[PDB]
């Protein structure tokens, strides 16, 4: 093979098989590793698009768990979802056939790679989709592995014939710590509440630098200037580190930044002084610093400016990130939908800012479905703080993920919280056939709607644009 | 640039930025070899070291600038630094390269660099690296490879301890001491035998290493060796045995020494026959030969390429390593250097002698390698030296140590007087070895010149000195 003359095959390995392929991060692992030759094969407990878009390239799924689907597989990679009592886990561990973590496989997908990491709180997806287009741009042929579809790809991973990996580090359970790679990005570190000892975020603190710890001595950490825990962190890595941001102290600093309908301008000054003046195609200040984050590392590889200029102009963003879903005319006036994967307060408050600066003086209405029972407990007083901000707000119910409900914690609490607050009045809607004809009795002529989260929603909105369609 | 350097580049990517890379202590051994790798891999090379030698004007000629004793200056333009553990913190390059913020690490850090893209063959275990990896870089070597390999020995053939060669492949002894090998990520990992000198922390060390092998990854463990086998379930990936054991993947069968020479089938786990001639003595050999064997069997090599080598296997130097036969006023004797330095590599050797010289003597001249393992071993020692038809014992390799009393070459040539197995000589001035050696020897001896100090330079001396 052409890809085996530069990518040695592991030994003995002809079958690899997952358990949960549906479930996050497995289908990129599975789509590098079929590209590569090897047999896939996966079974997970629904139908989806996901699932059955692996079948058409190639490998067989199977709806359900039952022993039998894990015939003649060499290893099995399981997702952070399965449970012991899972009987192709269970069968696996008596045939005696290696159980592996999917961070473990992703970290083999890297070992005889130059690896390019990303991390962090909050855009490891995006970030990682611009290093990817920049590395494609410059010619380099990158493979990459991203936890959202590359658009101009149409894919959330992809083979290429070259040494370069680009792939998002998930710190969850310290999963990344097998990751063995050459530069690594943080983009932030964010705590749940900044002015509390939390023992879960100085433990998390703990691991991002046994992360790092994991550069080789040459190797290079790149870190946003403007969040004082990555700052705070610097000493103890370690390895060169270079920084990003709006800080008069960034090694990559950020000037002029301005945004003009949804496209951000802004200049780079370099740590040599070289002045880059760019235009990105997707809007807000958080943007520009993921856009940095991606030039800096480019930058600091020798990749030239064209490449990098042209990516970031030509950027297309992930899939569900500010994803402009269309312009509809309604009764009640023309609107514009566009959903956003945001989930946590901050970064629903990074969308609705971004949103605010490309929208003059028509409305932000926005459709709120929370994930998980937890986070919405954890983070409650913040997503009732946020979600006020905007002109008109329609909740879903919350997005379970597998959770078992927490009282008071529900979408119900939430709508009568911010009610209380008393700057939007929110209307709850349950069940969401019901969705656009409740848009339709509040919509005004040129309203931006923000279909926001990260569950089922962008499902949700995927089926009112095509009935308005 | 040079068509060897473009064509390793293809394969092995530069380590970012990195430049010049410079060497504390570079003269010392596992210091060299790695050196050279990375000079002929097309980086600058400096180095120091307090003593000038042979090693140090063959790297210097080479390409790298080399100087004696430490100086900050040295340090010029430096993009790393690598240290041996011995070094200490008043050392002047030392203490200025960490204040210039220069990155520092160890040899096995800088070892385990060279391994990161490149697929990793690892040999550890109490005794036999030195020699198995020696095997195996000879295999890959005759199997056209062309394998880069980092040895802690001469490997004869080559002429050299460590060889940068323009394949992915990479042969490496590995070093229990201090953790080091912790640092490796290797492909394929041989552990040949484990035996003390505490001792479950060596144990939990081991099963460390070897869970730095990736899932698909094979451990090779010798079959024979009790406390290997009783780690076998904690290792968690692929164990292919090898030995005598009727229950080892690959078993010896059929072994019979002639002359110096080993003859034996191995049988491999589909039952194929394969019929070995060893170009080296001792079961021990067949061992490290057949942990060899079973690496490349597991790899695909074809069996003519392994059985040339180990026909024409030389050995690595100072391992039965022979010196010639010498016309001496009482007899015609044979001279042989060997590195065994605790007892039971000590009593291996005189057996693979035994083996090979029908009813003639075996006479030894033992040097002990430090007071502290003397002291430890005390009585094993006794014992194995207590196997030879005369002996002759220098004084303490010392090695740093101070003196102890009660571990010396006085104490131990007591003992085993009083065993009355045989009545040592103790030769403290070692000016009077030939002529003490000379009224004890008769026809047909075999001398083994015997530990891992300064012996070695003895034996050679009066090799010269009977030369002409
Ligand atoms: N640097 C940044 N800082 C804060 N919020 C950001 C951000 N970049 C993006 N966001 C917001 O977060 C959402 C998710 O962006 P993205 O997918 O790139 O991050 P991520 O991959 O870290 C999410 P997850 O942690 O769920 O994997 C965006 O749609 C935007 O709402
Ligand atoms: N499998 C084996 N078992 C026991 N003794 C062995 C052995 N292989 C070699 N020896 C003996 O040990 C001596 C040194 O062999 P060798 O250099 O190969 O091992 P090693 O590299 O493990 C020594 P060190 O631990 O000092 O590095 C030989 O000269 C012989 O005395
Ligand atoms: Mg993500
Ligand atoms: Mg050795």
């Given amino acids: ?56 390239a190639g490998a067989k799924i199977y709806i359900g768990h039952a022993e039998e689907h894990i015939e003649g597989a060499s290893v099995v990679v399981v997702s952070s979802a399965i449970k012991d009592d899972n009987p192709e886990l269970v069968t696996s561990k008596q045939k005696r056939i290696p159980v592996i973590q999917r961070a473990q496989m992703l970290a083999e997908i890297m070992r005889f790679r130059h690896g390019i990491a990303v991390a962090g ?15 494609t741009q410059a010619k380099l042929d990158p493979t990459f592995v991203n936890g ?35 530069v690594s990005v943080v983009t932030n570190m964010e705590p749940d509440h900044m002015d509390t000892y939390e023992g879960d975020f100085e433990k998390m603190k703990a691991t991002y630098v046994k992360f790092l710890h994991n550069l080789p001595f040459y190797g290079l950490a790149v870190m946003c200037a403007d969040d004082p825990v990555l700052m705070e962190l610097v000493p103890k890595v370690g390895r060169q580190v270079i920084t990003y941001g ?57 990749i030239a400016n064209e490449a990098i200029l042209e990516a970031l102009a030509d950027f297309q963003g992930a899939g569900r990130r500010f ?26 408050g990074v969308t609705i800012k971004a949103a605010r600066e490309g929208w003059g003086d028509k409305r932000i209405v926005m459709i709120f479905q929370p994930h998980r029972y937890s986070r919405t407990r954890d983070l409650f007083d913040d997503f009732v703080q946020v979600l006020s901000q905007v ?49 339709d009795q509040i919509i005004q002529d040129g309203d931006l709607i923000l279909a926001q989260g990260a569950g089922s929603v962008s499902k949700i909105s995927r089926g009112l644009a095509e009935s308005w369609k």
């Fill in 323 to 348: 994803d402009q879903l269309g312009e509809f005319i309604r009764p009640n006036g023309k609107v514009r939908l566009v959903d956003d994967y945001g989930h946590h307060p901050t970064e629903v």
């Fill in 391 to 439: 002109d008109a707000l329609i909740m879903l119910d919350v997005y379970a993920a597998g959770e078992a409900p927490i009282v008071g914690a529900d979408s119900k609490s939430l709508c009568r919280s911010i009610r209380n607050l008393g700057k939007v009045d929110p209307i709850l809607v349950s069940d969401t056939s019901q969705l656009g004809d409740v848009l």
């Fill in 148 to 182: 959202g579809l590359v658009k101009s790809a149409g894919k959330n991973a992809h083979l290429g014939a070259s040494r370069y990996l680009i792939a998002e580090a998930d710190e969850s359970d310290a999963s990344f710590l097998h990751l063995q790679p050459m």
């Fill in 121 to 135: 709180t909050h855009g490891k997806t995006t970030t990682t989709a611009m290093i990817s287009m920049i590395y």
């Fill in 246 to 302: 709006f800080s008069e102290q960034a090694d990559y600093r950020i000037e002029d930044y301005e945004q003009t309908g949804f496209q951000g301008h802004y200049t780079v000054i370099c740590p040599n002084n070289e002045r880059i003046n760019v235009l990105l195609n997707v809007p807000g200040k958080h943007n520009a610093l993921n856009a940095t984050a991606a030039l800096a590392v480019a930058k600091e590889e020798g």
């Fill in 1 to 56: 093979e052409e890809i085996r003359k530069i990518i040695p095959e592991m030994r003995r390995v002809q079958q690899i098989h997952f358990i949960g392929i549906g479930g996050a991060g497995m289908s990129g692992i599975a789509e590098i590793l079929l590209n590569e030759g090897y047999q896939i094969s996966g079974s997970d407990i629904a139908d989806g698009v996901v699932t059955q878009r692996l079948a058409q």
